Design a protein around this nucleic acid. Structure first.
Length: 533
RNA sequence: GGAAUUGACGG
């Protein structure tokens, strides 16, 4: 790259920093600057400095000039896409195309641009899929072909609180282009495919494509056998063995997670019987495979599978908790309630797992609230609490699922929570995971007198709870579950902290929802409007 | 206006 080229693209850069150029002129200058890339797309897109300017250009130009860049650069796009700087240039071009998805006049121009990209990729895909930079480009490209434009963690595919809450049960796009690109990424030998399964970056690409094909059963039934190398759907014994042995690999385990999530019923049933049945517990103790088990459990379809999973895993609930595999337990509990099978057996197995003697069953709640401290401590027969400590996220999610059961199945849990001394209860409410347990109990079908007993034990702390951003929710839910007598006590306690409360983010909504000002000025009128509630 | 598993990701 000669100095006139660098000086030119730098000077274009400085010209945009000096915001003396309206958007109208700006998008013209962007398109004109793209012409200075013709014949040297690779050199400029991979330049560690000028790549950043070229990103600015692709995101600020108009659809016609963007499409010309994608067409002119297409024979070198795979090289650009696999470069540490060029990959962000390639991704800028896709993000820019994606801004036009909502425009129906743009459909055929975009499709043509994707076609020239997909054609060069499909011609030689395997190194691009496995390249650390190129894998990100493919992920975005697959998303664009599907018509999604907004990056989502799950699609790329990170963990997210929304997916956990789903796992724990708490635009048309360019379809022919998606199918054509994906078929190109899959038309390799069974022996190549065996190693795509275990390469981090290719696994990530296939995870995205699988997720994008959710509920496209005719396609999923074509692509999943290719990924699993078992080309009616049937897994032969030798292939099932190879799948089972690769299940502890970190890359393949993530891929099988997604496969279980999108698998149509007949495909799921075959994987259940031919791969996982009889190995559930061994896979549940592996640091990678247990998450595959977590996904298997979540998408179980019928009570017969629920029986098989309960036999292999419930006797080992204590082992799973000790070895840091509470997610497996959480999933089994959660799906029993979804399938309406083995509900009582699951709750009773969890109690027995945490409380071996009969004496210790009154402590089921504190021990699940601090799952890791209790199973970690030197002497478990004296562990009572973990003062000051952050409570255990998955133990609290377990409890949140527990309280969605009918009260018939969870009497040990209700008794244990409603028995905790006042200081422990308010400690739970001040904890951002523990408050979700309390709110789950308040929403459960446990008796009102039992709810009222726990709420009464929070008296004297509603002011401080209201100051917590998480605890303030608990205050409303306590309030809504109360008689007039306790609605007034709570309202009175938010009164003493009204100045501080109104500062905080939630305060204004809390004060309004509870009508705290009306209580302070017209207490009789406040009381009579609540007794009507 | 709220915590988000124990195992991956970029000039």
């Amino acid at each position: 790259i000669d100095p006139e080229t660098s000086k030119y693209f730098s000077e274009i850069a400085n010209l945009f920093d000096s915001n003396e150029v309206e958007l109208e002129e700006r998008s013209v200058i962007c398109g004109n600057a793209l012409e200075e890339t013709r014949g040297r797309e690779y050199e400029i897109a991979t330049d560690y400095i000028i790549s950043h300017v070229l990103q600015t250009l692709l995101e600020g130009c108009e659809l016609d000039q963007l499409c010309s860049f994608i067409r002119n650069s297409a024979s070198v796009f795979p090289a650009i896409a696999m470069d540490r700087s060029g990959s962000h240039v390639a991704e800028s071009a896709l993000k820019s195309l994606a801004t036009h998805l909502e425009n129906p006049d743009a459909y055929s121009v975009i499709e043509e641009a994707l076609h020239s990209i997909c054609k060069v990729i499909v011609d030689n895909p395997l190194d691009m899929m496995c390249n650390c930079y190129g894998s990100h480009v493919l992920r975005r490209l697959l998303c664009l072909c599907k018509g999604v434009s907004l990056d989502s963690p799950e699609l790329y595919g990170a963990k997210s609180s929304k997916a956990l809450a789903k796992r724990l049960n708490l635009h048309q796009g360019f379809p022919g282009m998606l199918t054509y690109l994906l078929s190109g990424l899959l038309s390799c030998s069974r022996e190549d495919m065996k190693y795509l399964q275990v390469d981090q970056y290719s696994s990530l690409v296939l995870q995205t494509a699988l997720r994008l094909m959710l509920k496209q059963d005719e396609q999923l039934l074509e692509i999943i056998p290719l990924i699993l190398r078992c080309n009616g759907f049937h897994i032969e014994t030798n292939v099932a063995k190879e799948i089972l042995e690769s299940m502890k690999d970190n890359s393949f385990s993530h891929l099988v997670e997604v496969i279980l999530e999108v698998a149509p019923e007949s495909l799921y049933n075959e994987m259940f019987n031919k791969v996982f049945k009889n190995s559930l517990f061994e896979l549940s103790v592996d640091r990678c495979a247990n998450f595959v088990i977590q996904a298997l459990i979540s998408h179980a379809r019928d009570q017969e599978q629920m029986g098989i999973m309960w036999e292999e895993l419930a006797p080992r609930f204590k082992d799973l908790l000790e070895q840091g595999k509470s997610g497996v337990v959480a999933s089994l509990i959660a799906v029993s309630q979804r399938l309406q099978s083995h509900e009582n057996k699951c709750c009773e197995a969890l109690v027995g797992a945490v409380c071996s003697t009969n004496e210790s069953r009154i402590s089921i709640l504190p021990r699940l609230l601090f799952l890791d401290y209790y199973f970690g401590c030197r002497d478990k027969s004296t562990w009572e609490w973990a003062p000051g400590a952050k409570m255990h996220v998955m133990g609290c999610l377990i409890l949140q699922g527990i309280f969605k059961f009918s009260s018939d199945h969870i009497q040990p849990y209700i008794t244990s929570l409603t028995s905790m001394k006042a200081e422990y209860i308010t400690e739970t409410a001040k904890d951002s995971s523990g408050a979700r347990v309390i709110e789950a109990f308040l929403a459960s079908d446990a008796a009102t007198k039992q709810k009222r007993r726990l709420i009464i034990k929070l008296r004297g702390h509603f002011g401080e709870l209201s100051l917590h951003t998480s605890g303030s929710f608990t205050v409303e839910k306590c309030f809504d579950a109360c008689n007039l007598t306790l609605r007034e006590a709570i309202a009175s306690e938010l009164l003493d902290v009204k100045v501080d409360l109104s500062k905080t983010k939630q305060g204004p909504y809390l004060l309004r929802k509870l009508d705290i000002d009306g209580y302070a000025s017209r207490p009789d009128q406040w009381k009579s409007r609540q007794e009507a509630k």
